[PDB]
């Protein structure tokens, strides 16, 4: 119910790049409570997963950046 962690270990980063580009709603507020990171690396790492091409960008607003799962078939 208190402090999270910045700067990923090995155990959450492979958990990131195996299922976080799979599900449909993906947002820095989501993966800073479904994971055990706090945010501002939610914003940092999910920016570069848009830089790779594992997900799609939709909204891009300053209060709210919203991604989605990528084209499957």
């Amino acid at each position: 119910k208190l402090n999270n962690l910045v700067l990923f270990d090995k155990a959450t980063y492979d958990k990131l790049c195996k299922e976080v580009p799979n599900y449909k709603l993906i947002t820095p507020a989501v993966v800073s409570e479904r994971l055990k990171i706090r945010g501002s690396l939610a914003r940092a790492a999910l920016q570069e997963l848009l830089s790779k091409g594992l997900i799609k960008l939709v909204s891009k607003h300053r209060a709210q950046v919203i991604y989605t799962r990528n084209t499957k078939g």
């Binding site: 910045v6 700067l7 990923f8 270990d9 980063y13 790492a45």
Partner: protein, 145 residues
């Protein structure tokens, strides 16, 4: 860029007498030092030629040594004169930023100076009163009993 971490990451650092937090970033991690405020911290770092967006436990000891060195004697690193704590100090006539137990040293020293020669400011520090001419009839109740 830090996708996982490098090999060593201080949980806490250790700077003057303060163990600054290791998960903050340096612009707001060294503000735990009494004497390094929210404004002085950015200026020391910009004179330290660093990248501001790096976090706390991922500075090497050469970075930590050079950050402490610039905030220790800032008068020679081209930091201007009315940016410092002790501008024209009342015992020596010099200019210094004070950052330690020496901050609280020179804090009480002027308190006991005024208490010695019995100035009106020093008498209200010797009492539990307000100093900067505030009213006392209705405010500040929870200092006294």
């Amino acid at each position: 860029m830090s996708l996982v971490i490098p090999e060593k990451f201080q949980h806490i650092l250790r700077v003057l007498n303060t163990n600054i937090d290791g998960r903050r970033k340096i612009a707001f991690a060294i503000t735990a030092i009494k004497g390094v405020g929210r404004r002085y911290a950015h200026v020391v770092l910009r004179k330290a030629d660093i990248d501001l967006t790096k976090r706390a436990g991922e500075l090497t000891e050469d970075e930590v040594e050079r950050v402490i060195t610039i905030m220790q004697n800032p008068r020679q690193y081209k930091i201007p004169d009315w940016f410092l704590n002790r501008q024209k100090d009342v015992k020596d006539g010099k200019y210094s930023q004070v950052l330690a137990n020496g901050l609280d040293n020179k804090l009480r020293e002027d308190l006991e100076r005024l208490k010695k020669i019995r100035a009106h400011r020093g008498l209200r520090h010797f009492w539990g009163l307000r100093v900067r001419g505030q009213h006392t009839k209705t405010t500040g109740r929870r200092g006294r009993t």
